C-alpha cells in the first residue's frame, strides 16, 4: 500500500520548499516511486521540481518528497494557481500488474492577499436558473465545494476557481434550501454553511 501525507499541498510564494510524505505500509511490497508536477492543463511545464524524482521503497518505509519552486514570480500575484502533484508507485504468469498514481492538488498562493484562507468559504454565492446551479467565488482561493444539497437532494461536487464561477447539474424537483461544505488547506471539512442565493 502507498499513501500520501496530504490530500493537497499549499505552496506559498517565497517558500523554498514544501514537504510531501510518502509511506508504504506493506512489508512484502517493493515499489518504484516516480513523482512530478503538472499544470492545470496537465503538461509537465517545469514550474516545480520534485526531489527525489525517482526512488525505490523496499518494504515498510517512509520517504519525504520535497517540492521546489522554479517559477521566478511569473505566476499571477492576485489569486491562487492550480497545479497537480503526481506520485506514481510501480511494483517491481500472464499477469496484468498495475501501477498507482496518487494525484493531489498543488496550489501556488501569492503573498499579501487581503482575505485570509478561512474566510473564503462563507463568501461563496449561488444562482438558480434553468436545469443548472452556478457557484460564484470572489476570493483568490480555489474552493473545493463538497456535500452540496438542494434540500436533501444531493448534487455534484464542484471546484470553483478563484475570481470565477462553476456550473453544475440541477433538478427543480429537489428541495428549496441550499447547504454546502469545503475542504480546507489541511484536508478537513469546514462547518456546514447556508447557501445564500443571488
Amino acid at each position: 500500500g502507498v499513501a500520501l501525507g496530504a490530500t493537497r499541498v499549499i505552496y506559498p510564494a517565497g517558500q523554498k520548499q514544501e514537504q510531501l510524505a510518502v509511506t508504504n505500509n506493506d512489508e512484502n511490497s517493493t515499489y518504484l516511486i516516480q513523482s512530478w508536477v503538472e499544470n492545470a492543463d496537465g503538461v509537465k511545464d517545469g514550474r516545480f521540481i520534485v526531489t527525489p524524482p525517482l526512488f525505490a521503497m523496499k518494504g515498510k518505509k517512509e520517504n519525504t518528497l520535497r517540492i521546489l519552486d522554479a517559477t521566478n514570480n511569473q505566476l499571477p500575484q492576485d489569486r491562487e494557481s492550480l497545479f497537480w502533484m503526481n506520485v506514481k508507485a510501480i511494483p517491481s504468469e500472464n499477469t496484468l500488474q498495475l501501477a498507482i498514481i496518487s494525484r493531489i492538488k498543488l496550489y501556488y498562493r501569492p503573498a499579501k492577499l487581503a482575505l485570509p484562507p478561512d474566510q473564503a468559504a462563507e463568501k461563496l454565492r449561488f444562482r438558480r436558473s434553468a436545469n443548472s446551479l452556478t457557484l460564484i467565488n470572489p476570493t483568490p482561493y480555489y474552493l473545493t465545494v463538497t456535500e452540496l444539497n438542494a434540500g436533501t437532494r444531493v448534487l455534484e461536487n464542484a471546484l470553483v476557481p478563484p475570481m470565477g464561477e462553476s456550473t453544475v447539474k440541477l433538478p427543480s424537483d429537489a428541495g428549496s434550501n441550499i447547504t454546502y461544505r469545503t475542504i480546507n488547506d489541511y484536508g478537513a471539512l469546514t462547518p456546514k454553511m447556508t447557501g445564500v442565493m443571488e
Binding site: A3, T23, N94, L98, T146, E156, G187
Partner: protein, 154 residues
Amino acid sequence: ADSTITIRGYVRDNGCSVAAESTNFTVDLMENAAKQFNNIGATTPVVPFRILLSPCGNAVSAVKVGFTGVADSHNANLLALENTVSAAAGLGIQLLNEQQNQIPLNAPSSALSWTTLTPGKPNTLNFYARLMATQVPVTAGHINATATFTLEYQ
C-alpha cells in the same frame, strides 16, 4: 543564544493507502482455440480485481479514478497486450467497471466522474478484466500486460 527549541510540524487529514491487485490469466488457448465470433470477440471469462483504499483519513469522501496505458492499435478503449515474439495476437485486454460497462482507457479528468467513498472506513473498488478480439484469427502466445490506475483526490 539562550537555549531555545523551536518545534514545528503539521496535523492534516490524510488520503488513503492504495493497494492494487494484479489480475492473473490462466487461459491456455481457452476461447481462442474456438473463437472467430466475428472480430467483436468480447465474451471471454472475466477475471475480477480490486483496488483497496485502506486505511483512509477522515478527509476522503470522493475520488476521481481512471486507467491509463498503451491503447490498442485497432481499438482506442482496449488495452494493448505485450507485443513481444512470445505473445498472442489479435487481442486487447478490456477493463470493465463494477456494472460490467467498458472503462474509457486513457480518458481525461473532465470525462471521469466522482466515485464516492465512506470517510474513515476502508473502501473497496471492484473491476473486471476480460480479453476481447480485435482480429481473426487470434494465435498462441503469452498474455502479459501493464497499466496505471490513477486516483485523484478531491
